[PDB]
C-alpha cells in the first residue's frame, strides 16, 4: 500500500499514474512511501 503526504501532493500522484506512469516513480516524485502493510498510519497518509 502506498500512502503520500499532502492531499495536494497525492492528488498529482494519482494523476501521475493515470497516463500509465509507474506508481513507484510517481511516489518518488511526491516523497511518497510504499509499505508492505495494507494500511498506513495517519501520520503519513493523506
Swiss-Prot record:
The superkingdom listed in its UniProt entry is Eukaryota
- Which keywords label this protein? Disulfide bond, Plant defense, Secreted
Chief subcellular site? secreted
- Keyword Disulfide bond in the entry? The reply is yes
Q: Where in the cell is it found?
A: Secreted
GO cellular component terms given for this protein: extracellular region
The biological process GO terms on file are:
defense response
Can you tell me which family this protein belongs to?
Belongs to the plant thionin (TC 1.C.44) family.
What this protein is reported to do is described as: The function of this hydrophobic plant seed protein is not known.
Q: Mind telling me what this protein is named?
A: Crambin
Whichever gene encodes this chain, its name is THI2
Amino acid at each position: 500500500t502506498t500512502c503520500c503526504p499532502s492531499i495536494v501532493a497525492r492528488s498529482n500522484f494519482n494523476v501521475c499514474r493515470l497516463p500509465g506512469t509507474p506508481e513507484a516513480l510517481c511516489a518518488t516524485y511526491t516523497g511518497c512511501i510504499i509499505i508492505p502493510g495494507a494500511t498506513c498510519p495517519g501520520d503519513y497518509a493523506n
